[PDB]
């Protein structure tokens, strides 16, 4: 029995909620995932006088599955999954929700009961459901209305953006470096935020440290400021990216989490000093954390050669990993990062990159790869122009995506 399952969310970490739903389905032995749709963005469809608090942009998709679950049984499952993910199914109708799962279609089945109607009653009135459905089943008609060309119907409905964010194994982390103002204007950091979201960044990495020593106060205030602006723009954003804080200072981590933990997904450490206190902090806030190989080598003669680089990298990260684990932190919440720009010779960086899969395998941690615009990693001349850097970055990005590298950190998508 094939089904299309509609998935929607407009609260919490949106792409994560969707992924959790799909994983929960895929975990069932009596369900087979046939295909996942693209990601679609739309304004909350609301009743005419609903509180503006409910007006938060949606992320929608659908998945096609095969199952031995009969329709009523599958509905029970869907509710069970919404519950576990954290939805309040007695909450007011039309209100925001962490996850929503419905049966959009079941081939040409027509089922009409009070408790369950298939196809879903509103399928042909909702672009955020009909779009992903049509993406998955190209020639599909509502079985009651076989004469109705739903491609034209979808066009009539409009009001839907097909995002460039995807549900792929590899997510793109767009770089928001807050370290070009004019007489009356300083929104370049905002204009670049849009460029990232539009081009498909699933995550954004916000940092105020430069790659000149800057105070805790300055760093924090720069972060705090962008995050206040992010918050003011949240509800209308066509896609709400996961947020990573890019910093090496414990105090900054603490202050910023204390104030904005609700909207932060990940801490991306630039230098894993005081791993013990940081571990305690990651445990307290339950965020993702990225271990980087940055030993703070200041002498170029002492940079890592390639022949022992894999042992040097893994030994160090493993040691930091175990400390995190010993603080109760779930291994699945920890990522590693080679840190190409730190303490490594050119051929070493290139070498660590070529052997990235071996490293992930040995570390048993997911990988964050920061290759963007690094000549050494890209196998390019250091004095290469921005154009040749981004073209080499995109090509490498394609290869890492195919390798199912977990996160790639890039200046542009
Ligand atoms: C809030 C609203 C209208 N706006 C939206 N705007 C955008 N852009 N995107 C959205 O995804 C979106 N979703 C919306 C919305 O309310 N969606 C539906 C929702 O939450 N429903 C929960 C309340 S409920 O149906 O009574 C649940 C109940 O509906 C029943 N039901 C009947 N047919 C069903 C089917 N085919 N699949 C699943 N359940 C079925 C089932 O008994 C369930 O308990």
Q: Please give the domain boundaries of the chain with CATH numbers for all domains.
A: 1-164 (3.30.70.560), 165-413 (3.20.20.20)
Cβ of 103 less than 6 Å from ligand 1 = yes
CB atoms within 10 A of CB 214: 13
Cβ of 42 less than 6 Å from ligand 1 = yes
CB atoms within 10 A of CB 183: 5
Cβ of 119 less than 6 Å from ligand 1 = no
Gaps in the chain (C to N over 2.5 angstroms) fall after 179, 211
Residue 275's contacts (CB-CB under 8 Å, 6 or more residues apart) are 320, 323, 324
CA neighbor of 129 nearest in space, from 172, 159, 93, 107:
159
Distance from the alpha carbon of residue 108 to the mean position of ligand 1, in angstroms: 20
Residue 319's contacts (CB-CB under 8 Å, 6 or more residues apart) are none
Distance from the alpha carbon of residue 86 to the mean position of ligand 1, in angstroms: 16
Cβ of 237 less than 6 Å from ligand 1 = no
- The one-character DSSP state at 92 is P
Cβ of 216 less than 6 Å from ligand 1 = no
CB atoms within 10 A of CB 125: 13
Cβ of 40 less than 6 Å from ligand 1 = no
CA neighbor of 216 nearest in space, from 184, 256, 261:
256
What 3 state SS string does 216-230 have?
HHHHHHHHHHHHHHH
Token code pair at residue 124? 């042909």
Out of 57, 100, 172, 269, the active site residue is 100
* R_g of the chain computed on alpha carbons: 23
Distances (CA, A) of 35 to 2, 14, 136: 11, 20, 7
| Substitution site in 3, 53, 75 for ligand 1 pocket (most atoms within 8 Å of beta carbon) | 75
CA neighbor of 107 nearest in space, from 205, 23, 2:
2
User: Is residue 120 within 8 Å of 6, Cβ to Cβ?
Assistant: yes
The three-class DSSP label of residue 337 is: strand
Q: Residue 231: which H helix or E strand, with range?
A: helix 216-233
Cβ of 128 less than 6 Å from ligand 1 = yes
77-89 exposure pattern, b = at least 16 Cβ within 10 A, e = fewer = bbeebbeebebee
Cβ of 283 less than 6 Å from ligand 1 = no
Distance CA 173, CA 237 (A): 17
C-alpha angle with apex 366: 363 to 372, nearest 5 degrees? 110
Instruction: Enumerate long-range contacts of 303-306, CB under 8 Å, 24 or more apart.
Output: 303/343, 303/344, 303/345, 303/348, 304/343, 304/344, 304/345, 304/348, 305/345, 305/348, 306/345, 306/347, 306/348, 306/350, 306/351, 306/352
Upper half-sphere CA count for residue 398 (Cβ side, 13 Å): 5
CA neighbor of 39 nearest in space, from 233, 227, 197:
197
**100: annotated active-site residue:** yes
- The one-character DSSP state at 182 is B
Token code pair at residue 42? 């739309």
Distance from the alpha carbon of residue 38 to the mean position of ligand 1, in angstroms: 20
Distance CA 46, CA 126 (A): 12
Distances (CA, A) of 227 to 202, 205, 216, 221, 283: 17, 12, 16, 10, 22
Distance CA 242, CA 206 (A): 11
User: Closest ligand 1 atom, CA of 57?
Assistant: 8
User: Is residue 262 within 8 Å of 242, Cβ to Cβ?
Assistant: no
User: Is residue 356 within 8 Å of 310, Cβ to Cβ?
Assistant: no
User: Closest ligand 1 atom, CA of 94?
Assistant: 1
Q: Beta partners for 268? A: 246, 290
Distance from the alpha carbon of residue 122 to the mean position of ligand 1, in angstroms: 9
The method recorded for this entry reads X-ray
**87: annotated active-site residue:** yes
Distance from the alpha carbon of residue 199 to the mean position of ligand 1, in angstroms: 30
**350: annotated active-site residue:** no
Distance CA 75, CA 175 (A): 41
Cβ of 205 less than 6 Å from ligand 1 = no
**Which residue has a Cα nearest atom 16 of ligand 1?**
94
Out of 35, 80, 87, 350, the active site residue is 87
Q: Is 275 left (phi over 0), alpha (psi -120 to 50) or beta?
A: alpha
Out of 97, 126, 172, 350, the active site residue is 97
Q: DSSP secondary structure string, 264-325?
A: --EEEESS-TTHHHHHHHHHHHT-EEEEE-------GGGSBPSTTHHHHHHHHHHHHHHHHH
**311: annotated active-site residue:** no
Cβ of 58 less than 6 Å from ligand 1 = yes
User: Closest ligand 1 atom, CA of 9?
Assistant: 11
Upper half-sphere CA count for residue 240 (Cβ side, 13 Å): 29
Q: Is 4 left (phi over 0), alpha (psi -120 to 50) or beta?
A: beta
Residue 81's contacts (CB-CB under 8 Å, 6 or more residues apart) are 21, 24, 25, 99, 101
Distance CA 60, CA 77 (A): 19
CA 233 to chain centre: 18
Cβ of 17 less than 6 Å from ligand 1 = no
User: Closest ligand 1 atom, CA of 118?
Assistant: 36
Distances (CA, A) of 341 to 53, 344, 352: 44, 7, 12
CA neighbor of 211 nearest in space, from 339, 62, 362, 352:
339
Burial class (CB in 10 A: 0-12, 13-18, 19+), 181: exposed
Token code pair at residue 130? 């009909």
């Amino acid at each position: 029995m094939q089904y299309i399952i509609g998935i929607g969310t407009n609260i919490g970490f949106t792409i994560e909620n969707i992924h959790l739903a799909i994983t929960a389905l895929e975990s069932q032995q009596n369900i087979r995932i046939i295909r996942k749709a693209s990601l679609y963005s739309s304004k909350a469809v609301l009743k005419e006088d609903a509180p503006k608090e409910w007006d938060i942009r949606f992320l929608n998709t659908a998945v096609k599955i095969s199952s031995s679950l009969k329709p009523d049984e599958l509905l029970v499952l869907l509710k069970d999954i919404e519950l576990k993910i954290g939805r309040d199914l007695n909450a007011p109708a039309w209100s925001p929700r962490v996850i929503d799962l419905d049966i959009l279609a079941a081939e040409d089945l027509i089922l009409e009961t009070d408790k369950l109607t298939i196809p879903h009653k509103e399928l042909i009135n909702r672009s955020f459901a009909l779009a992903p459905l049509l993406e998955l089943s190209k020639g599909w008609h509502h079985p009651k209305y076989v004469e109705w060309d739903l491609n034209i119907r979808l066009k009539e409905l409009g009001e839907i953006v097909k995002l460039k964010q995807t549900l792929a194994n590899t997510i793109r982390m767009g770089i928001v470096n807050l370290s070009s103002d004019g007489n009356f204007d300083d929104n370049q950091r905002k204009l670049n935020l849009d460029e990232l979201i539009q081009s498909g960044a699933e995550i954004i990495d916000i940092g105020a440290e430069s790659t000149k020593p800057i105070s805790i106060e300055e760093e924090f205030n720069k972060l705090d400021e962008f995050l206040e602006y992010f918050k003011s723009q949240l509800a209308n954003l066509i896609y709400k990216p996961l947020v990573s804080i890019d910093t090496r200072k414990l105090e900054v981590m603490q202050k910023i989490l204390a104030k904005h933990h609700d909207i932060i997904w990940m801490i991306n450490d630039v230098e894993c000093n005081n791993i013990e206190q940081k571990a305690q902090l990651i445990a307290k806030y339950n965020k993702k954390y990225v271990i980087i190989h940055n030993l703070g080598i200041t002498d170029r003669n002492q940079y890592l050669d390639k022949e022992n680089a894999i042992d040097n990298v893994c030994d160090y990260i493993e040691q930091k990993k175990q400390i995190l684990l010993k603080h109760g932190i779930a291994q699945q919440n920890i990522y590693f990062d080679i840190g190409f720009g730190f303490g490594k010779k050119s051929d070493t960086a290139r070498y660590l990159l070529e052997n990235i899969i071996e490293i992930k395998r040995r570390l048993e941690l997911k990988a964050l790869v920061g290759h963007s615009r690094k000549p050494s990693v890209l196998g390019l001349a250091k004095d290469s122009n921005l154009a040749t850097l981004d073209r080499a970055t995109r090509e490498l990005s394609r290869k890492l995506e195919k390798l199912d590298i977990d996160i790639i950190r890039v200046h542009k998508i």
